[PDB]
Design an enzyme around this catalytic site. Structure first.
Site, PDB file in Angstrom:
ATOM      1  N   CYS A  19       0.760  -1.260   0.000  1.00  0.00           N
ATOM      2  CA  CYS A  19       0.000   0.000   0.000  1.00  0.00           C
ATOM      3  C   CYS A  19       0.803   1.331   0.000  1.00  0.00           C
ATOM      4  O   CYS A  19       0.402   2.297  -0.654  1.00  0.00           O
ATOM      5  CB  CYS A  19      -1.045  -0.017   1.130  1.00  0.00           C
ATOM      6  N   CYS A 196      -0.490  44.789  -3.407  1.00  0.00           N
ATOM      7  CA  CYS A 196      -0.644  45.558  -2.183  1.00  0.00           C
ATOM      8  C   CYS A 196      -2.074  45.497  -1.678  1.00  0.00           C
ATOM      9  O   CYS A 196      -3.018  45.780  -2.403  1.00  0.00           O
ATOM     10  CB  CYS A 196      -0.243  47.006  -2.365  1.00  0.00           C
ATOM     11  N   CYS A 207       5.450  42.809   5.800  1.00  0.00           N
ATOM     12  CA  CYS A 207       5.788  42.978   7.206  1.00  0.00           C
ATOM     13  C   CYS A 207       5.115  41.935   8.054  1.00  0.00           C
ATOM     14  O   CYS A 207       3.890  41.947   8.188  1.00  0.00           O
ATOM     15  CB  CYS A 207       5.386  44.361   7.724  1.00  0.00           C
ATOM     16  N   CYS A 210       2.876  42.742  11.088  1.00  0.00           N
ATOM     17  CA  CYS A 210       1.512  43.145  10.753  1.00  0.00           C
ATOM     18  C   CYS A 210       0.482  42.019  10.763  1.00  0.00           C
ATOM     19  O   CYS A 210      -0.716  42.294  10.866  1.00  0.00           O
ATOM     20  CB  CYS A 210       1.465  43.868   9.395  1.00  0.00           C
ATOM     21  N   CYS A 225       2.372  48.144  -1.315  1.00  0.00           N
ATOM     22  CA  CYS A 225       3.269  48.882  -2.166  1.00  0.00           C
ATOM     23  C   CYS A 225       3.941  49.953  -1.314  1.00  0.00           C
ATOM     24  O   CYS A 225       3.567  50.173  -0.157  1.00  0.00           O
ATOM     25  CB  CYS A 225       2.471  49.555  -3.257  1.00  0.00           C
ATOM     26  N   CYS A 228       1.469  52.776   0.139  1.00  0.00           N
ATOM     27  CA  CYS A 228       0.615  52.225   1.185  1.00  0.00           C
ATOM     28  C   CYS A 228       1.430  51.739   2.378  1.00  0.00           C
ATOM     29  O   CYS A 228       0.921  51.678   3.499  1.00  0.00           O
ATOM     30  CB  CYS A 228      -0.261  51.100   0.646  1.00  0.00           C
ATOM     31  N   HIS A 233       2.652  52.485   8.460  1.00  0.00           N
ATOM     32  CA  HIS A 233       3.655  52.580   9.507  1.00  0.00           C
ATOM     33  C   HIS A 233       3.875  53.982  10.045  1.00  0.00           C
ATOM     34  O   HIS A 233       4.866  54.221  10.725  1.00  0.00           O
ATOM     35  CB  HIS A 233       4.969  51.972   9.037  1.00  0.00           C
ATOM     36  N   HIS A 241       7.469  48.500  13.567  1.00  0.00           N
ATOM     37  CA  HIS A 241       7.420  47.304  12.741  1.00  0.00           C
ATOM     38  C   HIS A 241       8.601  47.252  11.802  1.00  0.00           C
ATOM     39  O   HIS A 241       8.814  48.176  11.011  1.00  0.00           O
ATOM     40  CB  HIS A 241       6.137  47.281  11.933  1.00  0.00           C
ATOM     41  N   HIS A 263      -3.315   1.152   6.943  1.00  0.00           N
ATOM     42  CA  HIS A 263      -3.515   0.977   5.507  1.00  0.00           C
ATOM     43  C   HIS A 263      -3.754   2.282   4.759  1.00  0.00           C
ATOM     44  O   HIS A 263      -4.669   3.035   5.073  1.00  0.00           O
ATOM     45  CB  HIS A 263      -4.657  -0.017   5.238  1.00  0.00           C
TER      46      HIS A 263
HETATM   47 ZN   LIG Z   1      -0.813  50.546  -2.117  1.00  0.00          ZN
HETATM   48 ZN   LIG Z   2       3.707  46.094   9.887  1.00  0.00          ZN
END
Ligand SMILES: [Zn+2]
Ligand SMILES: [Zn+2]
EC number: 3.4.19.12
Length: 341
Positions: A19, A196, A207, A210, A225, A228, A233, A241, A263
Site C-alpha cells: 500500500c 498591495c 511585514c 503586521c 506597495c 501604502c 507605519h 514594525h 492501511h
Molecule cells: Zn498601495
Molecule cells: Zn507592519
C-alpha cells in the site's frame, strides 16, 4: 478516458505491505504527467548502476501498463521493492526519498529559503499547526507554516506534495482539515508580482509584525506597495514594525493520499469537475485492487467551513470522512498537468 481505469481489477495490485507504494505511485502517475520527465531522462555519467533498470521497470512495467490498461501486477511492484533494498516501518516519505532522490536523482521538486539563508531543496513539505477557531484550510495552514518558519519558494514547484500535521506525540494523530481544491502561492513566492493589500497595487513591502493586526485584512499575509507602506507605519502602533522589501500562479489539488489505521488509500482527481473523484483501495493468496468512482467526496466538499465543523465526522460518508478526517498527503501541480487535454 477514465473508462479503462475505473472498477474492480483496476489500479495497482496489493501484496501484504505494498500500500505505501500502490497508493503513492497511483497518485503520482494515475492521471498526472507531473513526473513523466523522470521517466524520459537519459542516464548521465554520474548516475547509479541500477538507474536504468529502475527506469525501464517503473516506466515500462508499471506506469505504461497502469495508464494504458488501468491495472498493474503486484509482481512488478515487487520487482521494484527488490531494487529498493539494494539501496534501502515503511512510509510514502521514505519511499519517495529513496527512489527519486537516491536512485533516479530527480531535481528536488521544492526549492525553499528563509531570510537570505541557504536555499533548501526537498521533495515535499510538512505543515505544522499550533493552537488557534474552526475547521482549517490547506491555504490557511500552508500559509501559517511558511510564516511561523519564515520561508518562501525560490522558484515555483510544478509538483507540490504537502505532508499533513501529525499530532501524536510525534505522529499518528490527525484533525479535520480542508483540502483546498486550489492553491495560490503568489504571496509565498519570491520574485512574483504581489498585490498591495489596500489599493490593490504592486506590493514592495511585506511585514511580519503586521500579521497579528486584525484591522487590516485579518488573517491575510500583509504586504503593501511603497506608498501604502508609508501610511500603515505612520500609525503610532506600527512605528516600530521591522517591515522589509519583497524581492524584485495557481496549483490544483490532484490527489489526497490518505491513511487508515495501518492501511493507505488514495483519492485522485480525474477532471476539473468538483465531483470528479475516484477512490482507490490497494488491497480492495493475492489481493484484488479497486478504483471506484467517488462523486460523494464532492457534495460535502461544497460545504461551509464551520458547517464541516458542526457536523459529526463519524456520521458522514465512507469516502468523505476519510479524505477530510484521515488525509495524509495532499499533492498539487500546475493546472497544466492533468493527463487530459
Ligand atoms: Zn498601495
Ligand atoms: Zn507592519
Amino acid at each position: 478516458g477514465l473508462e479503462i481505469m475505473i472498477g474492480k481489477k483496476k489500479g495497482i495490485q496489493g501484496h501484504y505491505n505494498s500500500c505505501y507504494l500502490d497508493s503513492t505511485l497511483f497518485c503520482l502517475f494515475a492521471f498526472s504527467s507531473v513526473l513523466d520527465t523522470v521517466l524520459l531522462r537519459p542516464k548521465e555519467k554520474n548516475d547509479v548502476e541500477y538507474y536504468s533498470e529502475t527506469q525501464e521497470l517503473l516506466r515500462t512495467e508499471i506506469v505504461n501498463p497502469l495508464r494504458i490498461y488501468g491495472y498493474v501486477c503486484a509482481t512488478k511492484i515487487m520487482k521494484l521493492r527488490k531494487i529498493l533494498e539494494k539501496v534501502e516501518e515503511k512510509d510514502p516519505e521514505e519511499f519517495l526519498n529513496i527512489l527519486f532522490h537516491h536512485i533516479l536523482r530527480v531535481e528536488p521538486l521544492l526549492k525553499i529559503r528563509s531570510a537570505g539563508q541557504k536555499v533548501q531543496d526537498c521533495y515535499f513539505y510538512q505543515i505544522f499547526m499550533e493552537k488557534n477557531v474552526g475547521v482549517p484550510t490547506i491555504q490557511q495552514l500552508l500559509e501559517w507554516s511558511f510564516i511561523n518558519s519564515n520561508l518562501k519558494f525560490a522558484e515555483a514547484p510544478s509538483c507540490l506534495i504537502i505532508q499533513m500535521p501529525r499530532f501524536g506525540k510525534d505522529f499518528k494523530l490527525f484533525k479535520k482539515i480542508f483540502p483546498s481544491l486550489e492553491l495560490n502561492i503568489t504571496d509565498l513566492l519570491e520574485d512574483t508580482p504581489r498585490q498591495c493589500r489596500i489599493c490593490g497595487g504592486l506590493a514592495m513591502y511585506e511585514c511580519r509584525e503586521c500579521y497579528d493586526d486584525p484591522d487590516i485584512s485579518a488573517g491575510k499575509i500583509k504586504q503593501f506597495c511603497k506608498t501604502c507602506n508609508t501610511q500603515v507605519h505612520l500609525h503610532p502602533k506600527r512605528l516600530n514594525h521591522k517591515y522589509n522589501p519583497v524581492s524584485l500562479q495557481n496549483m490544483e489539488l490532484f490527489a489526497v493520499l490518505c491513511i487508515e489505521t495501518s492501511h493507505y488509500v488514495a483519492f485522485v482527481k480525474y477532471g476539473k469537475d468538483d465531483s470528479a473523484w475516484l477512490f482507490f483501495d490497494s488491497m480492495a493468496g493475492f489481493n484484488i485492487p479497486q478504483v471506484t468512482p467517488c462523486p460523494e467526496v464532492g457534495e460535502y466538499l461544497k460545504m461551509s467551513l464551520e458547517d464541516l465543523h458542526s457536523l459529526d465526522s463519524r456520521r458522514i460518508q465512507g469516502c468523505a470522512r476519510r479524505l477530510l478526517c484521515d488525509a495524509y498527503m495532499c499533492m498539487y501541480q500546475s493546472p497544466t498537468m492533468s493527463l487530459y487535454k
